[PDB]
Design a protein around this nucleic acid. Structure first.
Lengths: 138, 62, 132, 314, 65, 189
RNA sequence: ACGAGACUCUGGCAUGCUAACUAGUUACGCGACCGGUCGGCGUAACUUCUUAGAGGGACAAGUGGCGUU
């Protein structure tokens, strides 16, 4: 089923297909325990063990990713996982524990549900960068 | 060199040649009856507590 | 800077002057009514005029607004000013009157009035403020 | 007169509740629409611990929801949104099966036939759109129609000949029969725009309110002022109860409930934010309703909650 | 609005003393439906339509057909 | 559990400054498994203190036009020396970190004060935020110069400076900077 | 009254809507494991996942502390 509601950061995005499966989370043919930077795995296991590894009781989540930058994909892959968990937990099951885990991860941080609207600004001529300008000649 | 407590209750204004300091009113927690003025350097929040060497210092006053 | 310019303020002033009853209590009703009866080219401007309409109406609940000349405000002012007690403040049994104004009354053919009372004159003539 | 005692409070929502739905076959679960673009099914506990918890929230609107209805079962619903759309939700699966668009601007209220076969939608474009449930854009009245917005349309809940009534912002109401699409009556007498008009479930007592600040009564089949009723200014909601002669009117930042025998107030309920100074305003009420059996009062407010009041006899 | 409400032409004049440069800038009034000025109104200005009168009988009355 | 890097316990920290835990926080709910959350606190004011101080470190030993844009390297290099202070002092690195932040944190500084004169300086009180900023700056300056051109690698020069600043030892470059600030505060009343 | 503002493209939510065969993930075997995993891709194919359209949305609108209130 496709209850995917984006989950984004910068120009990279993730779509978290969710179904009633095995409880194994897959990221485009590779497990979330093994990602190319080899450094942000804790950033990926943060949501699940923050809310509880016991929650996944036969739910197969495959996230497909596309965009620029690896770390830019992260903070959205995990956002997509949290969105898929929210959609699953809103579709049928109760809300009291949903609100409990939501409060816990909201006090944990804010980049698990709501995307960062930030983006790279254009560069203005007459300088090397958007805000930096060349040196003054005396 | 005795040290006591002081916490901000009124941000009187900004002082310094180029906005260096904040002239702020601070109360001593151990006495909760005295208000003194300090040209505290740095971003100051209304209600922060800091350990100080000085308990009687005053600066330029207007 | 969130200062609202003369365009927003003046358009809201004209709207509340003109369609005071047509307004609503919620901002989202206010923008809809404003867009109904005003040629406002863009969404942002009609939003800004609607928002100042909400703020002006909030100011209405406590008093008049200087630039507005609605008839209902005059009716409200004239109803508020229509207050009267059962006893006039000038209706009192004893009126303290100095001897000099008593002589003024007596030369005015009103020295026979028994409603007044003798208040003694001041001890001295120390009424000027000190000089310099 | 019955005391309206404190059952508790409901919280856990972030939007003004505008339309509150009660189904006269499920006194345990009811629907309520809130203008944070959502419509939510409650769970009713009816104990001192807590009033209840939301059950299922359905969202399909780009803008806020104005009015909602339920067709004949807690598995169906029809919801009108501020974007000018109508959506038929199938609450057996929590999805929308049909969409209805014949308007160019906002829709204030939607009506539905007591036989669940006619859809009536009142918009801001001075046009009332009447569809059949088959999906045919069947009719609108455009000859000397309402000259302003259509604030609300309500239908007779009694099994009888269908009879529509529509309140406009031109300080007038129009009662029509859709069998012949011929004007039946046009009423004036308020001193302001109307917001809600509801019909008692026999076509006898018609209630009107809004910026006039006074509830005004007509007969669906006679056409005359039934009585002059005095009440709080600005009626944000008014309606009868389809079990008893009580009329509940949401007037000002509070609500009144009256009888028609002698026109006296049984319980004046004010929800107040108390400030030590002149600092705020009371949370104003938006909608009033009774339960499925009509013994508990639900009030949808702008403080992001639906308040519940219980009958205890006091 | 200088894109449409203002129309501009630059030109040169070649006399026996030299060259004279002119610019002519003509503003177009508001003429919707008629093609003399731009169809769209000036974006920064607001106009409030005249009020619609009231008829408020103190005694409610009905209008049967 | 919310232990740092999943291996350093976070339910053991004691700032012991009466009321300063709002301006130096590693227990706060913003403290996460990793010190990497991308820059979002620098935009507004008094939000910088809501940062998990691990992030402020991994970005403060992150400077000098050769490191900017290499934050994953900073997170690896803080994992390094976190697991090294885990063994050098045999205690949780957060305890020595709060000790360093509570001692190295300056109180008195000297600044030019006056509208019409330029002769001398006046003593001023450095607020907690600026004090932690300049203390971490001195720590990072020492850690850069302690491994600059030197055979000593990172995570040990930083480690040495951290340990000999956390106990109050004046042998630290940061603590000697603190002493210099205090003495120039003495000499410009 | 000109300028500023307003304007316009927009960065940023379209889960709502017109809608792709130069776009794209899931109903049966194609080379492997008692049910899971492929950008040579499985018959079947829905707008969520990229483009580009209309409407909506954010207003110091809500609360608190200051302010010639």
């Amino acid at each position: 089923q496709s209850v995917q509601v984006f989950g984004r950061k910068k120009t990279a995005t993730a779509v978290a297909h969710c179904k009633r499966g095995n409880g194994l989370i897959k990221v485009n043919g590779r497990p979330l325990e093994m990602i190319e930077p080899r450094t942000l795995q804790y950033k990926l296991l943060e949501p699940v063990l923050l809310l509880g590894k016991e929650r996944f009781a036969g739910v197969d989540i495959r996230v497909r990713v596309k965009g620029g930058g690896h770390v830019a994909q992260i903070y959205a892959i995990r956002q997509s996982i949290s969105k898929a968990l929210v959609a699953y937990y809103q579709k049928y099951v109760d809300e009291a524990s949903k609100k409990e885990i939501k409060d816990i991860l909201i006090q944990y941080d804010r980049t698990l549900l709501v995307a960062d609207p930030r983006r790279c600004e254009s560069k203005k001529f007459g300088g090397p960068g958007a805000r930096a300008r060349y040196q003054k000649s005396y | 060199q005795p040290i006591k407590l002081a916490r901000v209750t009124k941000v009187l204004g900004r002082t310094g040649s180029q906005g260096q300091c904040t002239q702020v009113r601070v109360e001593f927690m151990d006495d909760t009856s005295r208000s003194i003025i300090r040209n505290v350097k740095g971003p100051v929040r209304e209600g922060d507590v800091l350990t100080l060497l000085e308990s009687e210092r005053e600066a330029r006053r207007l | 800077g969130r200062v609202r310019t003369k365009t927003v303020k003046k358009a809201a002033r004209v709207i509340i002057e003109k369609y005071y009853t047509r307004l609503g209590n919620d901002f989202h009703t206010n923008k809809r009514v404003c867009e109904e009866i005003a040629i406002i080219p863009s969404k942002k401007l009609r939003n800004k005029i609607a928002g100042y309409v909400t703020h002006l109406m909030k100011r209405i609940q406590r008093g008049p607004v200087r630039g507005i000349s609605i008839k209902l405000q005059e009716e409200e002012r004239e109803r508020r000013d229509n207050y009267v007690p059962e006893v006039s403040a000038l209706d009192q049994e004893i009126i303290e009157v100095d001897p000099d104004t008593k002589e003024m009354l007596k030369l005015l053919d009103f020295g026979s009035l028994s409603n007044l009372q003798v208040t003694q004159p001041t001890v001295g003539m120390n009424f000027k403020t000190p000089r310099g | 007169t019955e005391q309206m005692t404190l059952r508790g409070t409901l919280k856990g929502h972030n939007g003004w509740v505008t339309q509150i739905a009660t189904t006269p076959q499920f006194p345990d679960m009811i629907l309520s629409a809130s203008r944070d673009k959502t419509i939510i099914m409650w769970k009713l506990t009816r104990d001192e611990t807590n009033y209840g918890i939301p059950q299922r929230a359905l969202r399909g609107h780009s803008h806020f929801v104005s009015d909602v209805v339920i067709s004949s079962d807690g598995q169906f619903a029809l919801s009108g949104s501020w974007d000018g759309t109508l959506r038929l939700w199938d609450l057996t699966t929590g999805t929308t099966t049909r969409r209805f668009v014949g308007h160019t601007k906002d829709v204030l209220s939607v009506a539905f036939s007591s036989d669940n076969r006619q859809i009536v939608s009142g918009s801001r474009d001075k046009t009332i759109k009447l569809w059949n449930t088959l999906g045919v854009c069947k009719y609108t009245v455009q000859d000397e129609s309402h000259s302003e917005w259509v604030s609300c349309v309500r239908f007779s809940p009694n099994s009888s000949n269908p009879i529509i009534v529509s309140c406009g912002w031109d300080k007038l109401v129009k009662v029509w029969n859709l069998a012949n699409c011929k004007l039946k009556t046009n009423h004036i007498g308020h001193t302001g725009y109307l917001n809600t008009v509801t019909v008692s479930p026999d076509g006898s007592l018609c209630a009107s309110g809004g910026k006039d600040g006074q509830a005004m009564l007509w007969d669906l089949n006679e056409g005359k002022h039934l009585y002059t009723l005095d009440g709080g200014d600005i009626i944000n909601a008014l309606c009868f109860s389809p079990n008893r002669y009580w009329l509940c009117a949401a007037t000002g930042p509070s609500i009144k409930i009256w009888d028609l025998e002698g026109k006296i107030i049984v319980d004046e309920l004010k929800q107040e934010v108390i400030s030590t100074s002149s600092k705020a305003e009371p949370p104003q009420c938006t909608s009033l309703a009774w339960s499925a059996d009509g013994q508990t009062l639900f009030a949808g407010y702008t403080d992001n909650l639906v308040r519940v009041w219980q009958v205890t006899i006091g | 609005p200088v894109n449409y409400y203002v129309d501009t032409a630059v030109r040169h004049v070649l006399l026996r003393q030299g060259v004279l440069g002119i610019k002519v800038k003509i503003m177009l009034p508001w003429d919707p439906t008629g093609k003399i000025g731009p169809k769209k109104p000036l974006p920064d200005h607001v106009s409030i339509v005249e009020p619609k009168d009231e008829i408020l009988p103190t005694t409610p009355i009905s209008e049967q057909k | 559990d919310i232990k740092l890097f999943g291996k350093w316990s976070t339910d053991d920290v004691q700032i012991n400054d009466i009321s300063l835990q709002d301006y130096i926080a590693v227990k706060e709910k913003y403290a996460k498994y990793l010190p990497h959350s991308a820059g979002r606190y620098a935009a507004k004011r008094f939000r910088k203190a809501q940062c998990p101080i691990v992030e402020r470190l991994t970005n403060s030993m992150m400077m000098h036009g050769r490191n900017n844009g290499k934050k994953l390297m900073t997170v690896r290099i803080v994992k390094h020396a976190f697991e090294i202070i885990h063994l050098l002092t045999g205690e949780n690195p957060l305890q020595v970190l709060v000790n360093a932040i509570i001692n190295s944190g300056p109180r008195e500084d000297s600044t030019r004060i006056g509208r019409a004169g330029t002769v001398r300086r006046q003593a001023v009180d450095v607020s907690p935020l600026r004090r932690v900023n300049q203390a971490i700056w001195l720590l990072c300056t020492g850690a850069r110069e302690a491994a600059f051109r030197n055979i000593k690698t990172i995570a040990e020069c930083l480690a040495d400076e951290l340990i000999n600043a956390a106990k109050g030892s004046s042998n630290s470059y940061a603590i000697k900077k603190k002493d210099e600030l205090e003495r120039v505060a003495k000499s410009n009343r």
